Assembly symmetry: D2
């Protein structure tokens, strides 16, 4: 019955199940959760691990003895449960000092503090076992056109990430960075707003091999984009270092619904792609149990994230295994798409009369693609109606 186990590599942020329910129109509906309790409860649900922002684990402004005690308690819970910490990140968005950004704040002193706050937490992440360090620049951007020179900001962003790469290299760490794009919210427009913009930026870093993306389902959908397509481009580029799973109903505020909610068909095609491609990273849920829920509803929502992934994994596997689907894929020429267009080379293509002077455009145009029957087989499999 679709029970998750640690082999599935499902992970959750402390800030997910720990979200107290504050929204901009509403006060908290749930009391604060001790990270120790979250580790224990998530382990009981079959999770593989947890993730954290610095400020989720160590209250901002803590002394060293407070910091040590908070980390000690968390480590003890990890050791007790066997839960891993595959990824961590920096909170460079909540505190008022970051109201104009961290790495791209107009004020240089804030930019430097943001880097120092990040570097301190990279050390802690490595200590606790993280393989990926995520950066979500939620405050990098603007509400008005004059407030941020984006060319200068990209220079500052490159400088920051280059320094972080120099740091991890100098320390001999194996951890790598994953940039998490988002188009807007909390800023009117956020810099590096989609997977594409982040991938493009990475190519201009000094050590691009150290950086990939951490795409989030709902974020790309807030720009109306096809999340499986974006993941495909990230995989094509060798840059899918981590992924954030949740649900979103199209173009509106960032809903962070449990995975499977929002665009269910997109969730199906996403799981099909991750499993087919052999993605081996964490299946991380960056979601919020709605503020209508008590703690029983928190754990039900987290359990649902994993359950929906596993149902979709079964259905996508059954789809790909079905001989009738394999036939429909051939009927739609998915096999031909994987063949090189012109491995014979440019000169041969130019000399091939069948490619132009003798090409029967009307006969080619008459061929149906058979995509509707293929998609109805996919629907039948998703719904278990085969």
């Amino acid at each position: 019955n679709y029970q998750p186990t640690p082999e599935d590599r499902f992970t959750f942020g402390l800030w997910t199940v720990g979200w107290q329910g504050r929204d901009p129109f509403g006060d908290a509906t749930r009391r604060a959760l001790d990270p120790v309790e979250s580790v224990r409860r998530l382990a009981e649900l079959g999770a593989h691990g947890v993730t954290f922002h610095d400020d989720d684990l160590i209250p901002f402004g803590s002394s060293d003895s407070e910091r040590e005690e908070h980390v000690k308690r968390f480590r003890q819970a990890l050791d007790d449960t066997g839960m891993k910490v595959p990824m961590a990140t920096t909170n460079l968005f909540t505190h008022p000092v970051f109201k104009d950004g961290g790495f791209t704040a107009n004020d240089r002193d804030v930019r430097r503090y943001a880097l120092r706050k990040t570097i301190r937490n990279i050390d802690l992440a490595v200590e606790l076992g993280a393989e990926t360090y995520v950066a979500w620049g939620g405050r990098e951007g603007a509400e008005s056109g004059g407030a941020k020179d984006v060319r200068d900001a990209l220079d500052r962003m490159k400088e920051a990430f280059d320094l972080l790469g120099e740091y991890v290299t100098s320390q001999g760490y194996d951890i790598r960075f994953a940039i998490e794009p988002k188009p807007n919210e909390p800023r009117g427009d956020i810099l590096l707003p989609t997977v594409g913009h982040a991938l493009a930026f990475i190519e201009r870093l000094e050590r691009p091999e150290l950086y990939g993306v951490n795409p989030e389902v709902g974020h790309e959908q807030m720009a109306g984009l096809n999340f499986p397509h974006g993941i495909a481009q990230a995989l094509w580029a060798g840059k899918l270092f981590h992924i954030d799973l949740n649900g979103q109903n199209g173009i509106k505020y960032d809903q962070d619904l449990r995975f499977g909610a929002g665009d269910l068909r997109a969730a199906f095609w996403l799981v099909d792609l991750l499993e087919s491609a052999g993605y081996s990273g964490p299946r991380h849920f960056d979601f919020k149990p709605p503020r209508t829920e008590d703690f029983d509803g928190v754990w039900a929502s987290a359990a649902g994230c994993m359950r929906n992934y596993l149902i979709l994994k079964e259905r996508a596997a059954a789809f790909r295994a079905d001989p009738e689907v394999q036939e429909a894929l051939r009927a739609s020429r998915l096999d031909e798409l994987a063949r090189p267009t012109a491995a014979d080379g440019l000169q041969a293509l130019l000399d091939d009369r069948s490619a132009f002077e003798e090409f029967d455009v009307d006969a080619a145009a008459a061929r149906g693609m058979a995509f509707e029957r293929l998609d109805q087989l996919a629907m039948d499999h998703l719904l278990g109606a085969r």
Copy 2:
């Protein structure tokens, strides 16, 4: 009185002023326009040049004789007016043969034909003096998840662009390519849906220096994105080879309104950025006079494109030259954003107590950004209400 001159480098596609008004729910409302007339009338309006798809200039399926005559008549009009042809492109979207794409059609024979059709028109573009060859892959994509393996499609897209780069290099042509992103329409989702995705793809081509972007105002806005921000990233990357100017009311079908319509404030910030950055390429309008209009309205709409650019250029220049605006920019620390964050280097940053232990977080947080006064100065300048 905001009169365009050819030195402004305003250009128009033949298919813009020549759009006959067919939409998916409506038949054509205007008769066909002779390209010769378009050249002459656009010259009278102060345009610098025109652009074309192959099939706009030469009816699809024309004999070599008919093709020569169509080109000859067009060249005579260019020669008589001094009008230029700075850009050309291929129609790989109208004919039914391209219903599943050109370079990424599932059928391999179609992919080879698309390349041959493109190569033939590159030759014609060079004959006419085009400096940029645009590719808008409007049929590259899918309506359903199983129809298109996006990793394979990106392989085919790269193969195609690599072959085109080999062709131009082998022939010694100075022309360069510009990929035009669009998120959707006519396909449910289009491959390379935004400026970011196209920039990222270009970095993986064999000869990336031959390829840039041709972003279109309305296309990025169909994903709810900030067009000036995207242009800034293209400029930062050295990839703004060409630009398409029009208007769009947010997230809906591609409207192709005249430039200045749609998001007027975004148009202001775009013109400010292009002029401030010293962009020297064509200011090309890919717009459609609404089908409500007769030909007097066609030419009025084309004139309006250029007029609005020039008004916005004046207001943006006045904004930048106003000492009160410059003071506001300094108050908001836009000048400080241009200073390197840590040119002192990583070790110095790590050793700098002013960047962490002695950083006064609450004093920094108390500093206002003064962005609202700056933005109201921008509004006052845009509206001529200073």
Copy 3:
């Protein structure tokens, strides 16, 4: 195996399976279908009936003998198959004369012609058995703010609909009108853009009982709205006279995907609502088989519309029948929502100290809503994973 039969009341527009594939960037990919063939093929698939615009059945500009022969052939096909015609409509959008609208064209002569064209087709619709006459005002609206005075346009729209109501009343017809809202496309903004605006307008007609709505899944979703919620308000108002079923991926051009595609979860909740409420009207599909398809794909796509409705009907029925769901609905207080708030009346409510002075806000606030477990039961049922 989810086979449709005529008892299911599935209907299709001639223009759906008959769409030749022309889009604004592409020429037709399929030859024209004879309505006689469409009637026969749809009957073979298990449809209950067909619908038409005047211009789908009778080419615009036909003589009376041509009109009679076209109607005769269509009637013979209806008689041969037993297919019904439950609804018909007027094409007031394709021909260039309607480029500024029909009933709200600025030109009064066009407004009067639009009414005469509609009235002629009302007579034909009644002859062929239609119970509903749909009006989709796809050209009523504007691309620019000055082009249409919306207060005047609403006066003209009310006048037109009032005259149509006078006509049907004077003739003694039982047919009723259903206004089909759409937010945009082909006009930049369309008048009466959502179910709400149409419902509000109807209340100001002279004989409001003669008018309801014909909401379309994709149209409300083009404004990002919740289609089941809109249908609920239409049912609450007694105004769901007809419905158009299809799929849409959120906020973009009108995709007209087959029903079940697009927002699958919304399709589930829609079918649950229609079946629970006892909606007895046609389940009409206003969709377009993608232009990638040949005619085998056309019929597969139409069959898929019906199949998906039937799968969702089974899953929603199983959801409502499940004792565990009935328990979850109680846990979430859906039963309490159906109870009057204050059937004791205003004075009793004002005098009830338990409603205010003695109301324990913190105890009430602590109660979880249990909505996540309820929604995961719904997901499990939709996916057949119970």
Copy 4:
């Protein structure tokens, strides 16, 4: 120089200039503002009045003594400045007790409490002189399909508004209600999501004359709708009792930018419509100075709201008074749109050969609308470039 005066009837909510800057990813950036200071500073800026939620003026849970003192201090500031309070509203969204709604909470006890809390504040509103009592049901709705039976919820919403209408009638109060639609946020979908849905609902209330709409610029734009068009329908219905002015960049989270920001052209057409129609109600700003700002920026942003309204009023008046614009309006037949279509009556229309058999369709279709020249005149006027 576009200086506001109290006779302009500009008003502001206490919660606007008093927003402390908490967003869902960020803590407050500004300290709390005393309502007395807001009254005095807004008066100095030229405002006419202020508005309030109960909980903005009186901390939730205050004793009767504390409540009296808070109101007394506020009234003293109003009396000292001559500032008015034209509108008031209830906070039925912040406290956790309202997490599933007020009037449509599933729990019946919460619905009764919400009504009592509202009624208490209606009394206070009357004491302070409010002519309109706004209801923004920000928590009425759902994140999941099973959580909220929308027909039952509309029954509960109608019951609540009917009881409130009975209350004001029984007390002899002249105050009227204005329902503020919003499509989403903080709920995944909000009930009565647009102006249209609210207008439709009002027509089914027991005393519809007591209820109108309070539309908000940004809210309709969050559904991609045309705000001036929606206001036109509200005016056509006699239901524009109040209006909320701000800015929004299309389809994303509710930005509450200062008026004139966001869609500047829509702001122009809105001001044109309100002034042309003779709207006499408050011009109320429901906006938030961005959290980047200090208090100097707060007051600059508030001043900017009024300044932009006044600039746009000037430009719209100049547009309407320009004989060249009036000529363009006639050329586009805006005057003809005001003529009744068929005041001659149904029979005369049916008998009029000029409306059908002798209507020259091709001559009518050939007439251009001249909308582009008209819109460029509007652009020129907006930008002061005539």
